[PDB]
Design a protein around this ligand. Structure first.
Ligand SMILES: *CCC(=O)N1CCC(Oc2cc3c(Nc4ccc(Cl)c(Cl)c4F)ncnc3cc2OC)CC1
Length: 270
């Protein structure tokens, strides 16, 4: 473990400025990092996890935090600092444009095929890096991809589950609680479907308990109108029951990179 990669922050070093979101996990804020002895105010995001009733020990938390601090890839968010008190507070660079799911929903009219394909490439690059580190994300979804700038996105919330999204999970994860890189590939396929539909809800209106029976019967998310069969076939391959028959993230990089070269060929957008 490279301890230098992770800053242990003092409560005086950072300030919460505004609420960005809240959920069962806790609260996420926009704030400022003001390291002592420096002349800079750094915009950051601060995530405060809900106070644990039987928390993991501080040693265990730091061990996971070191892993999150060691991620070095342009398409995966890195843990910048941590503050451990009654709660766990995580500090990361601010991604000013928010989650990609909100972004595609707000910009449905103005999003072209090259943007969409470039995002697919960047997401697969991030996931491939995590696989290279032998790390399983387990919660990839459009809501967990953040927009640093419109053409630079990063996968977030890695390791947060350690420290249930049935509609993004591979069948084996639902039935047997098995999570692997190939189950991440299934989630990747759903994430791409979210983007191609400009933020539609997958299996809209269907209860979580019914999803597995839908998947067992061979039903899958429908082909988005803008996707050519070439793009849809890739998405469908991510949803095969046999996990090893799904594409590899390394393969997804190559395919979407090729399509990104001729976007109008692979996406038909008004
Ligand atoms: C859009 C889906 C949704 O409702 N939300 C996701 C984005 C949230 O707004 C922003 C969050 C961040 C984060 N989040 C974050 C994730 C992991 C970790 Cl460890 C940490 Cl410390 C985080 F802060 N990170 C960076 N920038 C942003 C920016 C956001 O909006 C500008 C709201 C809920």
């Amino acid at each position: 473990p490279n301890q230098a990669l992770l800053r242990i922050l003092k409560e005086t070093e950072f300030k919460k400025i505004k609420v960005l979101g809240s959920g069962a996990f806790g609260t996420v804020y926009k704030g400022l990092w003001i390291p002592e002895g420096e002349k800079v105010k750094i915009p950051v995001a601060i995530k405060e996890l809900r106070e644990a009733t039987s928390p993991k020990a501080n040693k265990e938390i730091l061990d996971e935090a070191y892993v999150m601090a060691s991620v070095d890839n342009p398409h995966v968010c890195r843990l910048l600092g941590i503050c451990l008190t009654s709660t766990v507070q995580l500090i990361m660079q601010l991604m000013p444009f928010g989650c990609l799911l909100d972004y595609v929903r707000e910009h449905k009219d103005n999003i072209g095929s090259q943007y969409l394909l470039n995002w697919c490439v960047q997401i697969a690059k991030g996931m491939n890096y995590l696989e290279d580190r032998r790390l399983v994300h387990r919660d990839l979804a459009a809501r967990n991809v953040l927009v640093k700038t419109p053409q630079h996105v990063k996968i977030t919330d890695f390791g947060l589950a350690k420290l249930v999204p049935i509609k993004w999970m591979a069948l084996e994860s639902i039935l047997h609680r098995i999570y692997t890189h190939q189950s991440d590939v299934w989630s990747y396929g759903v994430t791409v479907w979210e983007l191609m539909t400009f933020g539609s809800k997958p299996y809209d209106g269907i209860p979580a308990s019914e999803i597995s029976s839908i998947l067992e019967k061979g039903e899958r998310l429908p082909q988005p109108p803008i996707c050519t069969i070439d793009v849809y076939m890739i998405m469908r391959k991510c949803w095969m029951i046999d996990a090893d028959s799904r594409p590899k993230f390394r393969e997804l990089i190559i395919e979407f990179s090729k399509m990104a070269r001729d976007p109008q060929r692979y996406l038909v957008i008004q």
